[PDB]
Structure formats: structure tokens, C-alpha cells
């Protein structure tokens, strides 16, 4: 009436919960790159010679 | 701290164009047009007002 060893298991199942990968879009930056410093339009000379 | 009285390199007196400069900037004028309308021709004078930091207004805020 006691507990005895039974037949060895024939296989093992290991369960884990996993989600999946999306598409590669690689959206690097809101406003991207190093935007260049640049000329103010027209500007004009702010200096003249004497005479 | 407070506006220099005379431009350092030349000596031109710029200590009376501080309030006029502030008034022309409140009216919508660029710093270039503003410095022109004040008579600051050579850039040695223009740097004297363009790059002035008025720290007398921040010291004049702690108790007497
Ligand atoms: Zn000067």
C-alpha cells in the first residue's frame, strides 16, 4: 500500500512564454544628423570706410 | 555688472546707449539693425553692447 518507483519518464517538456520580433525600421533620430550652421539671408555689410 | 562707460579698444562712449539699445530691441529690430541705429559702426564698439551681460539687475535683488 506504499508508494513505489514507476517507469522512467520517456520525455521532458519545458514551457516558457515568449513574444516575437517586429520589422526593422531603425528610426534613428526625431530631427536627425548634425544639422549644419548656415548663412543668414542677405545679411548686408554693417560697416563702411571713411570718405 | 553695469554697462562700460567707454568702449575699451577705442574709447567711444557707449554708456548712454544701453537703454536706447534695450528700447530698440523691444520694438522689433534685430541686434544688427539696433546697433546700426545707435551709431556703433566699427565692430569693437558693437561687441561692447552686443555681448554685455547686465548683472547689476540680479545683484539688485538681495535684501538692502
Ligand atoms: Zn570702439
Amino acid at each position: 500500500g506504499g508508494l513505489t518507483c514507476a517507469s522512467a519518464p520517456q520525455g521532458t517538456l519545458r514551457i516558457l512564454e515568449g513574444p516575437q520580433q517586429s520589422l526593422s525600421g531603425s528610426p534613428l533620430q526625431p530631427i536627425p544628423a548634425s544639422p549644419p550652421p548656415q548663412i543668414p539671408p542677405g545679411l548686408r555689410p554693417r560697416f563702411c570706410a571713411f570718405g | 555688472m553695469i554697462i562700460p562707460v567707454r568702449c575699451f579698444t577705442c574709447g567711444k562712449i557707449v554708456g548712454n546707449k544701453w537703454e536706447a539699445y534695450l528700447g530698440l530691441l523691444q520694438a522689433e529690430y534685430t541686434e544688427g539693425d539696433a546697433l546700426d541705429a545707435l551709431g556703433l559702426k566699427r565692430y569693437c564698439c558693437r561687441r561692447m553692447l552686443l555681448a554685455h551681460v547686465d548683472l547689476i539687475e540680479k545683484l539688485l535683488n538681495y535684501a538692502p
Side-chain angles (χ1 to χ4, degrees):
Chain A
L3 300 172
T4 189
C5 276
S7 300
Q10 288 66 0
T12 303
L13 295 176
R14 211 269 243 73
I15 302 170
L16 42 141
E17 177 210 81
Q20 295 177 335
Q21 293 177 335
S22 65
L23 294 174
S24 65
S26 64
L28 352 91
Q29 290 282 294
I31 160 179
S34 314
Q38 55 192 359
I39 319 288
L43 282 184
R44 230 189 75 262
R46 303 242 169 263
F47 172 74
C48 61
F50 51 90
Chain B
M1 210 193 92
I2 187 160
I3 188 68
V5 28
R6 283 204 213 249
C7 164
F8 307 141
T9 355
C10 279
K12 191 197 198 57
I13 284 176
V14 304
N16 50 346
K17 311 171 158 36
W18 185 231
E19 283 88 9
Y21 184 59
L22 293 196
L24 282 165
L25 284 190
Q26 286 145 24
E28 346 107 359
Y29 267 36
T30 55
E31 289 84 2
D33 301 346
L35 290 154
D36 296 349
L38 295 163
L40 304 182
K41 267 84 75 181
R42 63 179 76 89
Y43 63 85
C44 75
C45 313
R46 298 167 69 93
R47 89 173 150 79
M48 204 68 46
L49 284 177
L50 185 74
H52 179 246
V53 59
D54 203 32
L55 305 170
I56 186 69
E57 294 180 354
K58 297 193 166 189
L59 298 145
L60 279 192
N61 286 306
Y62 294 81

